[PDB]
């Protein structure tokens with residue numbers, strides 16, 4: 001069916017843009033920052049940690065932009081709608097992708113080549129927001145997302161006809177309905193429909209991610225970093 005091909009193309013787009021390989025991430029779980037290395041990060045200036053973390057986060061976004069660009073029918077949307085969907089959803093996808101890099105056993109994340117806890121980031125002074133991000137990954141870790149499940153769920157995070165400001169809402173609805181069918185179909189074929197009831201509630205991802213982006217906007221205002229835009233019109237609604 002056109003649906004099994006849509007499943008295959010979404011998984012392919014994901015596989016090509018997932019940035020880090022699951023085998024690598026799982027294999028390096030034992031490669032953990034030492035007390036001294038942690039202290040090294042904690043003593044850095046707020047502004048150097050910000051530069052590092054901002055560069056890594058914009059690179060994560062760019063992989064999500066390529067994921068979207070390779071999604072069947074994503075380019076056939078009007079550029080306004082491309083921007084609206086990426087502007088509402090790209091960071092939500094990055095926060096979802098974090099669960100693959102996150103180890104629930106010791107509440108660590110993969111960062112510059114090893115695993116560390118949220119205290120790595122103490123110099124940024126965002127204790128409560130970073131803790132929220134870690135908690136969200138802790139929740140998503142319990143689902144043991146397969147790669148294809150992550151691919152199909154993140155596709156649906158982006159392709160959402162409820163985002164305000166769409167010019168061709170019906171064209172987005174058609175992608176969304178197809179991806180919904182692809183996702184349900186896949187879950188049925190793998191006996192994993194049970195994850196549907198365990199998915200994060202939409203307002204949760206939305207309000208966590210809008211706080212995150214709001215804090216990044218504030219740091220970017222106090223201490224601008226500069227990046228070579230992959231999607232210039234989209235860069236402009238965030239680097240404006």
Ligand SMILES: CC(C)=CCC[C@@H](C)[C@H]1CC[C@H]2[C@@H]3CC=C4C[C@@H](O)CC[C@]4(C)[C@H]3CC[C@]12C
Nearest residue numbers: 019053056057060094097098101109124126133
């Ligand atoms: C609040 C603030 C100013 C910063 C947030 C600090 C911290 C929570 C950020 C900084 C770098 C991020 C990772 C970057 C890259 C990836 C790879 C992606 O494929 C999956 C996600 C992941 C691992 C990001 C996770 C969140 C990190 C650690």
Ligand SMILES: Cc1cc2c(s1)c(-c1ccc(C(=O)O)cc1)nn2C(=O)c1c(Cl)cccc1Cl
Nearest residue numbers: 054057058061087090091216220229230231235
């Ligand atoms: C939903 C989205 C939020 C968000 C996006 S999209 C982008 C972004 C990045 C690059 C490109 C591109 O074209 O290369 C396009 C978009 N940055 N960003 C941020 O929150 C952000 C980051 Cl990650 C770092 C520093 C400052 C900020 Cl404000």
